[PDB]
């Protein structure tokens with residue numbers, strides 16, 4: 118059922134990027150609180166990523182999971198294109214990560230579990246999120262994890278979370294999310310991605326050679342899970358099912 122900008126009351130700016138802007142909004146007749154992401158058609162055409170917005174809508178609208186930010190629908194003004202998303206009251210994991218510096222093993226493995234379930238769901242529907250970052254992770258009213266962005270998501274730039282196979286241009290499958298999950302787990306425990314550098318060029322070879330080191334405070338149980346996930350060879354990477362069954366995850370999930 119088609120919408121309009123006159124059906125909403127726009128509020129606080131939730132986040133701000135170059136693509137567009139995200140605001141808090143409320144539907145006038147139902148008083149429903151939702152996030153209203155605004156996209157401008159002029160840099161949507163200039164970047165020629167009409168596919169992704171079409172794929173973000175097409176994929177995220179039918180995907181339905183407690184750990185996936187729901188897409189309610191969309192519409193477009195004469196000028197810009199407006200997206201109607203679920204509102205996540207407790208904000209991003211990103212800022213939650215820069216305020217706490219790092220996460221403890223319980224909060225970490227809990228996030229990994231919530232992500233695995235959401236990924237085990239997505240994968241069994243032949244969907245690859247590929248772009249798993251903390252900036253795409255939001256928090257629900259109970260503090261649960263919610264995957265948000267699908268603006269690079271398909272069926273089978275910024276490098277820090279991208280696997281060797283993807284950055285070198287090779288054909289990539291649903292195993293690229295297993296790499297991202299490992300990179301994410303690491304960053305949750307340390308506060309910084311395993312392969313971060315000061316240059317795109319250096320980072321590229323950190324990923325390709327798989328060169329990461331553990332600080333001393335990282336437990337052996339975690340070092341094992343991350344090492345299994347960050348294997349250069351996509352076939353050596355565990356299934357999401359054995360990740361859930363991992364001793365460290367099990368002894369430290371909620």
Ligand SMILES: Cc1nn(C)cc1-c1nc2ncc(Cl)c(-c3cnn(Cc4cccc(C(=O)N(C)C)c4)c3)c2[nH]1
Pocket residue numbers: 131132133139152154202203204205206207208209211212252253255265
């Ligand atoms: C933030 C925030 N604080 N509080 C109390 C609630 C929110 C919040 N609820 C949200 N619900 C849905 C969405 Cl799509 C968003 C949202 C908007 N931009 N973004 C992307 C983004 C990426 C990187 C940084 C930021 C940002 O502005 N901060 C402050 C972390 C944002 C996500 C949501 N953001």
